[PDB]
UniProtKB/Swiss-Prot annotation:
Keywords: Acetylation, Apoptosis, Electron transport, Heme, Iron, Metal-binding, Mitochondrion, Phosphoprotein, Respiratory chain, Transport. The keyword Transport applies. Mules and hinnies are heterozygous, having equal amount of horse and donkey cytochromes c. It is found in: Mitochondrion intermembrane space. Heme c binds at C14, C17, H18, M80. SUPFAM superfamilies: Cytochrome c (SSF46626). The keyword Coiled coil does not apply. This is Cytochrome c. It comes from Equus caballus (Horse).
Length: 104
């Protein structure tokens, strides 16, 4: 994937709702401390819907690569929406970047 690439794709589109290199808190949006890690519903104490809260999927490509296209697509029972990096190539950059971004 890419680091500086998805580093700009992330801080440009999911930066106000997904924190990874800034801290990983539930700021205006949920951080990515659950990305590529087997666990999806990180700390449900945030506001996940009735699925990501204590979900059971993962966040590699097909899991993210799918989500990224359209949030509700992976789980329309979610409570977030944003169709920005739905293209594809850049999408991958987003994942890889994050993989080591929130690995701080
Ligand atoms: C707020 C306006 C959001 C933006 C912008 C993006 N996401 Fe989102 N995402 C949001 C919420 C609130 C949730 C959790 C469900 C809920 O109802 O609270 C999510 C979920 C994800 C997930 C899965 C959750 C997990 O445990 O990992 C992923 C993988 C995810 N979001 C990715 C993602 C990306 C790549 C975004 C930018 C292209 C993005 N989200 C925007 C809130 C918001």
């Amino acid at each position: 994937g890419d680091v500086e690439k998805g580093k700009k794709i992330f801080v440009q589109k999911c930066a106000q709702c997904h924190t990874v290199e800034k801290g990983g808190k539930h700021k205006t949006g949920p951080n990515l401390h659950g990305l590529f890690g087997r666990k999806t519903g990180q700390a449900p104490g945030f506001t996940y819907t009735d699925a990501n809260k204590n979900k059971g999927i993962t966040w590699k490509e097909e899991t993210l690569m799918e989500y990224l296209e359209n949030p509700k697509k992976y789980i329309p029972g979610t409570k977030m929406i944003f169709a920005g990096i739905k293209k594809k190539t850049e999408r991958e950059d987003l994942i890889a970047y994050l993989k080591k971004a929130t690995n701080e």
